[PDB]
């Protein structure tokens, strides 16, 4: 019962944490794509206002 | 009568004790099979959450 109690403290919902892991990968990658786009827009500006 | 009295103290119901012996074998083996299964489930988890 005591190791179970500990296990509740250290309970990893491994499915949750893999899922959340997945999500955070997705979110990182998406945000970086948008950072690229943030660097693309002012180049378009550069040409258009040259 | 006295050796019979002793025999009552040391009375082995040999049929009972063979029967109970049998049962406890069965129960040990069953429990170990379940311990194997307890080790099988988290492997299924490992694959499924890989």
The rounded Cα A39 to chain-centroid distance in angstroms is 20
Q: Does A14 touch chain B (CB under 8 A)?
A: yes
The residue in chain A having the minimum alpha-carbon distance to the alpha carbon of residue B50 is: A18
Residues in chain A: 50
Give pairs for B5-12: CB < 8 Å, separation 24+: none
Cα end-to-end distance, chain A, whole Å: 74
The beta strands (E) that lie in chain A are given as none
* HSE-up (13 A, CA, CB side) for residue A4: 1
For an interface test with B, give the residue of A14, A19, A22 to mutate (most B CBs within 10 A): A14
Cβ distance of B45 and A14 shorter than 8 Å: yes
Cβ distance of B45 and A18 shorter than 8 Å: no
For this entry, resolution in Å reads: 5.7
* Number of CB pairs, chain A paired with chain B, less than 8 A apart: 4
| DSSP H/E element including A45 | helix A14-48
């Amino acid at each position: 019962n005591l190791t179970a109690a500990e296990s509740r403290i250290r309970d990893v919902d491994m499915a949750k944490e893999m899922s959340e892991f997945t999500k955070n990968n997705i979110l990182s990658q998406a945000s970086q794509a948008m950072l690229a786009q943030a660097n693309q827009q002012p180049q378009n500006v550069l040409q258009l206002l040259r």
